[PDB]
Every structure is written in C-alpha cells, then in structure tokens.
Write a protein that binds this DNA or RNA. Structure first.
Lengths: 217, 95, 79, 69, 125, 115
RNA sequence: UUUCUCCCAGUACGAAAGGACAAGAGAAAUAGAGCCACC
C-alpha cells in the first residue's frame, strides 16, 4: 500500500473538511490523469501542454530530487543535465496542463532529498532524456540505489557534513577528514533524536486515507 | 487585523475588489479571490462590492436574498464560474 | 524509343545548363579535355540529363561515358 | 576522392528537386546557395570527411530537405 | 485570415529578393514557422515591413492584437513578430553574414554554432 | 536574480566576449525600474575594458514553478542599433523570451538551442 | 497610489511634412492594508 505524500494533511488548525473536499477533487483528477507511484531518486518523464507553443506538448526527463506540497497543490521536482547545464523543473501533480506522467525508471536513492547532487559530480546528475523505460516489478519494493556520490571542492550550497542534514549518500571521507566531521558533529543536538515534541503521528490518519482513496477508485 | 502586540494590529480593515470563483451550497462555502485580513477561524463580514464599476450588480442576483424555502429550482451543490476549470475536466491543452 | 530524339534531347539538356560553355557542343563533345569540366561539372551535367529521362542512371558507369553520344547509347540500351 | 561518387550525383539532383518543391522560400536563392555549397566543400575533402559530408546530406535529403519549408 | 501562404505571397508581391521560411515540427517547442526576408535597401525594408503589417491588420486577426514593428531604426535588420510566424527582414549582404537560414535549417549542425568559443575568468588573487 | 556584482558568463561569439580575459565581466545595474535583473532584462556588461549592452537569458536564483532553474548566469550581447553583437548563441535559451514584453525576436533568431 | 507601452489610429488634423485626443486594454513601479497555496 503506497499512500502518496500529498494525501496526508499537515498538522494545524485548518478544518479537516477542506482536505476531504480537496481529496475528492484530487481523486477525480487522478481518474482523468493517472499519477504513477514514484519516489525521490526515480527518473521520470512528464508530458505537459506548452503555453508558448500551440498544440505541442513537452516532455522533460530527470531524476526526482524533492517532493513537496500537500493536497491539490502538491509539486515534485526532477533534475537533469541538458547541454551540460544542470536544470531542475518543479511540476504540480494536479495541474490541468500536465498531459501525462511517465516513470521511466522507478527507483529510490539513499537520501530523501537529492539537492546535494548539485555539489556532486555531473555524471551522477547526468541522465539521457531519450532513455527508454526500464523493467519494473509492481509487487515489489522500488530499487534503492546505494551508490555514494562524490562531492566537488569544499565550498557547497549547504553544510551536508553537519549531523542535522544526516546525508547518507555523500563520500564525505574522500573530501572531509575525520577531524572535520567532528567539527561538523559539534551541532549534533543529540536530544533531538529523542525529542518527542517534534514527532507527529499519522498512523491512524494514513490508515484511514487508504480506504478513502481506494473507495473512490 | 491580527494583533502583533506591543512594539499593533487588532484593528478592522477592509479589502476591496475580491472576485468570487465558486460557492458550495452543501457546506455554504464561498471561494473569494485574494487574501482576507485576519487569522484562520476568524469571523469576517461579507458585503457587495462598493466600487463605482460594480454599482448595480444585484439586478441579476437574488434582490432581497436567496430563499431555499421557495425552492423554485434546486441549485447545484457546487457553483462554478465560467473561466474556472472544474476538477475532473480534461487536461487543458494550450492549442 | 527514338534514337534521334534521345540524341537531340540529350544535347538539349546539355545545352540547358548555363555554366558549361557550348563553344563546341557536338555529338562527340568530350568533357574533361574538350570542355574542361571539373568533377562537380560532370556530376551536375548528368543530373540534368537524369531529370529529363527519369534518372535511374548511376555514376558507376556514367562518369566513364565522357560524351553525349555515349550517354545516349547508355540511355538507349537501358530503355 | 569519394567512397562512392554515385551518392554525390544523386545528392545534387535531389537538392534541386526539393528546391522546385519548396514554395515558401525563394527558389532563386536556394538554387544558388546549393550550387555554392557544392563548390565550396566538395572540391577538396578527405575520404573520412567526405563520407560525413555526403552522409549528412543524405539525411538532409531524406528528411524533408532538413526542415526547409 | 492571415496565414503563412498569404504573407509569403504578399512578400513576393512587394518583390522580396530573398525569402526563407522554416517550419518547426511539434517536437521542437517554438513557433511553427520562422521567416527570413531580404530587401535591397533600408527604404525597401521599411516599405515591405509596413506592407505586411497593414495587410495583417486588415486581414481579420481580430482575436490577435495589433503587432508592433521592431528594428525600424536599424537600416539592415527589421523583424516583425506575428501570431504564427516571425519575419526577419534584412539586406542581402546582411543575410549571408548572419545566416539565419543555416541556424534553423541545421538546428544543431550549423557551422557558425561551432564558431562560438569559451573563456576563463579567474579571480585576481 | 542578477543583482549588483553577480559575476556572469558571456554566452556569445562577440570578439570581446569570445576572447578570454583575466577579469570576469560584471553587472552592477539593470535596465529596469527595479534593481533586480532576471531573464529577458537588458544590462550593460563591462567586457575587455569596454561597455556593451547585454540581455539576460539565465539566472541561478530559484524560479517559479514549472520553470527550469539554471546553474550559471548567461547573457547575450546587444548592439546599440538593437541587433545582437554576436551572430550565434551556444547555451540553451528559454523560449519564454518570445512572449515576454520587449523586443526579443532578433535575439531568439540568433539562439540555436531552445529549452 | 504613480509611471510606461498598446489601443483608439498613420486615423482627427494637415498641401505635404508630420501627427492628437478622450474612452478602452496590458504591463510594470512604489506606497498602503493584508496574506502563506507555492517557493
């Protein structure tokens, strides 16, 4: 049972009725447009209607690096290098102008966010736009890529070495000495792993959502 | 307006020229363009636009009010504006 | 097929092209030496002939013809 | 010089046919441009380089004159 | 309506020395047609540019808005952007130098594309 | 977001841009009512000890949804007469410039690659 | 709140050169009051 992230509502004082109405519209749109299951690190090809062009669609292929948003306003970003230029495009799942969504390669990566791939070598981020879909097994877990990317010189967009980021796909040893890691570890905040004030329980909510989604089908 | 404490706020303010996109009859929910001052779950006052352009818009609307008691013609549960793209409609292609 | 028609028509298509100078455009007009034609010249000249008669002429033996009457014979015997 | 001069001949003729089948462009300029293109490149080339020139033109030949409309 | 065939005929009517129109397949996400036009002199360039726009406005195009003329100040390159076609008008000599026809005809194989070069921009220290 | 400074890459075949130089070209203003420069905004770029107008075609600032975020700042040189300084553009150029308000037909025609 | 462009319209007007109004539309900019769907 794969429950898509957008269906899970975020905690707050907003009325649950909005989510129920939003989910109904989302489920209705899902019938019009099929949203395939995918995870961060999967390479996807998405078909969208071109506003600048007249009656011509657009297909962009890239590795999924981030999933954000909830409800009808949920969006996903996939990254690729085109003509040697790294490009990231954010696609809204329920936008009427997205004609079709294709999961060219369904797979998972070590980390839930792949923004560090910008600091990684280009080859880890380069993907052929015309690559054909690879075989996948529906009744199985998505393949998990455990390859550790190599970083570029120390100046990075973010301090991935810090424990808070907790990136498990970076070859820190090659670019960072153990002493440097210890300096990064000074921001460990060990109580955070044990802090119950930052934990949000959605087990009951997730279970309830599953039947509602299936019932609409 | 939301109160910001000693530094403010907690004063009545009005936003003008907000269009209505859709109304839900079952839950009596009105969809209004733009943002509304105040916090969530806060009561607000709704009244017809007073701008000169929309001087007489009630001529084609229920003049005193809408009476469900009359039930001359049962209204749809969800009311949509013509430009609004309803959910479950075909994907929009910019042809 | 008319051999006379092919001969005059082959001459006509040769005459049509402007770059080559028909100072002596005889039935035995040679290309490399008589007309001083370059490789591209004989490349294009055959194409003008091909247009009139529906091509099907390959250069494997066309460049060896070297004169209007020989292509006339090649057209005649392939027709 | 060419691997096969037969391709060169067919290539030149086909370019001319498409020029007469090309409406929106100015046929006069296209004919002159193709003639110049043949003169500038085909006079001197290498066997490997010449193969690319004729091969690319063949795709140009077989692809609606390479988008010329 | 104002379409490609009407404009090209109008361009021929005003005696455009060189016209090149390149169609765009659906895969390429740009205008369906790109047009390049030659003109003998800047006076001819101004006249032809005005003629096409005047015909366009008269020839329906009610749904489309009026089209402004770009490059009239330049004496060697005038470009007008219509709804479905873009016409770039220049002098004959300017035509070869820019080679707009090569760019679209050879989308990635144009020779002038290779002419572009790279650089290095290190800090002083 | 081409703000003040903001080292940039000259994507053009112009002699000044094409020739390597020890100092990077810099952008310390924008030809707009606001001070921030984005794609399609004219600028003036100091290249080879000379000042030439340039048109922004890419930026590294995060963009709106449904748009590609570039990793390098790319610009195209434009002459005073309005024609581009360079006759060709190498880096892919977004096609949104066509609909953007202004005169972009000349630059787009010179753009070989579109994304 | 202010500005620019377009439109009206190469029209009115004017021998020509040249060249408007008002009304309407789109863009921005700043100020003010707010807002967090997205980033």
């Amino acid at each position: 049972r794969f429950l898509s992230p957008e269906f899970i509502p975020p905690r707050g004082r907003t009325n649950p009725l909005k989510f129920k109405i939003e989910r109904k519209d989302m489920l209705d749109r899902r019938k019009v447009l099929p949203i395939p299951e995918f995870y961060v690190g999967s390479i996807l090809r998405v078909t969208t209607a071109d506003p600048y062009a007249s009656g011509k669609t657009s297909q962009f292929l890239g590795i999924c690096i981030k999933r954000s948003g909830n409800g009808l306003g949920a969006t996903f970003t996939l990254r690729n290098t085109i003509e040697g230029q790294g490009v990231e495009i954010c696609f809204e799942l329920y936008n009427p102008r997205i004609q079709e969504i294709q999961v060219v390669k369904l797979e998972k990566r070590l980390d839930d966010n792949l923004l560090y791939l910008r600091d990684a070598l280009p080859e880890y981020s380069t993907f052929d736009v015309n690559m054909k879909p690879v075989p996948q097994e529906a009744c199985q877990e998505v393949p998990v890529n455990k390859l550790k990317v190599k970083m570029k010189p120390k100046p990075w967009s973010k301090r991935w070495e810090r424990p808070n980021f907790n990136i498990k796909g970076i070859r820190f040893d090659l670019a960072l000495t153990e002493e440097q890691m210890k300096e990064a570890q000074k921001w460990n905040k060990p109580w955070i792993e044990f802090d119950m004030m930052r934990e949000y329980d959605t087990s009951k909510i997730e279970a309830a959502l599953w039947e509602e989604i299936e019932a609409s089908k | 307006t939301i109160g910001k404490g000693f530094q403010m706020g907690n004063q009545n303010r009005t936003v003008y020229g907000l269009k209505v996109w859709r109304v839900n009859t079952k839950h009596n929910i009105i969809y209004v363009n733009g943002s509304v001052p105040g916090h969530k779950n806060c009561l607000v006052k709704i009244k017809d636009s007073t701008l000169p352009a929309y001087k007489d818009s009630c001529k084609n609307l229920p003049f005193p009010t809408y009476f469900p008691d009359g039930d001359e013609e049962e209204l749809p549960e969800d009311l949509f504006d013509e430009s609004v793209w309803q959910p479950s409609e075909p994907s929009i292609t910019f042809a | 097929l008319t051999l006379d028609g092919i001969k005059d028509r082959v001459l006509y298509v040769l005459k049509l092209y402007d770059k080559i100078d028909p100072e002596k455009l005889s039935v035995n007009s040679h290309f490399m030496k008589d007309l001083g034609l370059d490789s591209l010249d004989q490349v294009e000249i055959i194409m003008a002939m091909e247009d009139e008669f529906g091509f099907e002429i390959p250069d494997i033996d066309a460049e060896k013809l070297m004169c209007p009457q020989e292509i006339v014979d090649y057209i005649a015997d392939k027709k | 010089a060419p691997w096969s001069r037969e391709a060169v001949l067919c290539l030149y003729r086909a370019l001319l046919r498409q020029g007469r089948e090309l409406r929106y462009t100015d046929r006069d300029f296209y004919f002159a441009s193709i003639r110049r293109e043949f003169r500038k490149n085909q006079k001197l080339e290498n066997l490997e380089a010449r193969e690319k020139q004729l091969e690319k033109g063949l795709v140009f030949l077989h692809s609606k004159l390479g988008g010329l409309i | 309506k104002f379409d490609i065939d009407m404009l090209v005929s109008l361009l021929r009517q005003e005696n455009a020395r060189d016209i090149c129109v390149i169609q765009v397949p659906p895969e390429m996400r740009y205008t369906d047609y790109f047009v390049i036009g030659s003109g003998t002199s800047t006076r001819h360039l101004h006249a032809m540019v005005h003629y096409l726009v005047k015909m366009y406005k008269h020839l329906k195009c009610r749904s489309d808005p009026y089209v402004k003329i770009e490059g009239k100040d330049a004496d060697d390159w005038l470009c007008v952007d219509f709804g479905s076609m873009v016409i770039h008008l220049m002098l004959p000599e300017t035509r070869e130098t820019y080679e707009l026809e090569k760019l679209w005809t050879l989308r990635s194989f144009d020779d002038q594309l290779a002419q572009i070069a790279a650089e290095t921009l290190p800090e002083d220290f | 977001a081409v703000q003040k400074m903001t080292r940039v890459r000259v994507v053009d075949n112009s002699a000044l841009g094409s020739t390597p130089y020890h100092r990077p070209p810099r952008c310390i203003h924008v030809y707009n009512k606001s001070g921030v420069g984005k794609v399609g905004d004219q600028i003036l770029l100091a290249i080879r000890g000379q000042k030439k107008k340039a048109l922004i075609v890419g930026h590294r600032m995060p963009g709106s949804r449904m748009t590609p975020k570039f990793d390098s700042n790319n610009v195209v040189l434009i002459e005073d007469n309005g024609n581009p300084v360079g006759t060709r553009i190498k880096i892919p150029i977004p096609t949104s410039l066509r609909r953007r308000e202004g005169e972009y037909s000349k630059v787009l025609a010179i753009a070989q690659n579109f994304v």
